[PDB]
C-alpha cells in the first residue's frame, strides 16, 4: 500500500497528476469552475463530461523527500497552463477549503504565510480518496443549483480517485 499513480509508480513529492474518477458514469477529472456569482473560476469541481481529464494538480509536502505516503500533509495546487484571463496573473493556484461553506476553492490571492497543506491521500477500496484535516474528513461531490459538481468536504461519501501522470 504505497500511493501509486495509475501506471503503478509511487506518487512523487511535487509531481503533477490529473485527478480522475475511479468510478465511471458521474463525471470526469477535477478542474476549475465559476460558481454562484464569482466572475473568476475559483471552485474546484469535477468536470461534468466523463471524457474530460480536467486540469493537472501539483501535489507536494514541505519535507524534502522524494515520494508521498498517506501519512504526509499535502499541498494541492492546480497547474497554471492555459488559464482564463482573470487567473493569468497568478503563478500558483493553491487549493484551500473555505470554512463554513466547506467548498474546496483555489486561493491565488492569499499570502504564502497563510497557506499550508492540509490534505492527505488515502487508499480507498481499490483506489484512493482525498481527505482534508481541519482529524480527517473525506472530500466528495456536492451538486449546486446549476449542476456544478463541487468538490467539498463530505465525510463518508468520498470521491474515489486515481492519479494519472500529467505529461508535458
Q: CA–CA separation, 28 vs 97, rounded Å?
A: 21
Is 1-168 a CATH 2.80.10.50 domain? Answer: yes
Phi then psi for residue 112, to 5 deg, are -55, -40
Q: Cα torsion at 144, 148, 152, 158 (round to 10°)?
A: 110
* Residue 40 cell numbers, joined: 473568476
Resolution in angstrom units: 1.8
Query: Over the chain, what HEC string results?
Result: CCCECCCCCECECCEEEEEEECCCCCCCCEEEECCCCCCCCCEEEECCCCCCCCCCEEEECCCCCCECCCCCCEEEEECCCCCCCCCCCCCCEEEEECCCCCEEEECCCCCHHHCCCCEEEEEECCEEEEEEECCEEEEEEEECCCCCEEEEECCCCCCCEEEEECCC
Boundaries of every domain in the chain:
1-168
* Residue 46 cell numbers, joined: 469535477
Amino acid at each position: 500500500k504505497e500511493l501509486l499513480d495509475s501506471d503503478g509508480d509511487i506518487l512523487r513529492n511535487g509531481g503533477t497528476y490529473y485527478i480522475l474518477p475511479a468510478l465511471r458514469g458521474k463525471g470526469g477529472g477535477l478542474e476549475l469552475a465559476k460558481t454562484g456569482d464569482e466572475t473568476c473560476p475559483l471552485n474546484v469541481v469535477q468536470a461534468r463530461s466523463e471524457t474530460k481529464r480536467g486540469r493537472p494538480a501539483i501535489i507536494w509536502t514541505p519535507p524534502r523527500i522524494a515520494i508521498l505516503t498517506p501519512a504526509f500533509y499535502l499541498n494541492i495546487e492546480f497547474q497554471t497552463r492555459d488559464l482564463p484571463a482573470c487567473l493569468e496573473e497568478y503563478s500558483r493556484l493553491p487549493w484551500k477549503v473555505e470554512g463554513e461553506s466547506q467548498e474546496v476553492k483555489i486561493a491565488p490571492k492569499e499570502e504564502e504565510q497563510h497557506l499550508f497543506g492540509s490534505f492527505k491521500i488515502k487508499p480507498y477500496r481499490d483506489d484512493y480518496k482525498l481527505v482534508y484535516c481541519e482529524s480527517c474528513k473525506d472530500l466528495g461531490i456536492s451538486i449546486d443549483d446549476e449542476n456544478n459538481r463541487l468538490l467539498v468536504v463530505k465525510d463518508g461519501d468520498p470521491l474515489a480517485v486515481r492519479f494519472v501522470k500529467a505529461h508535458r
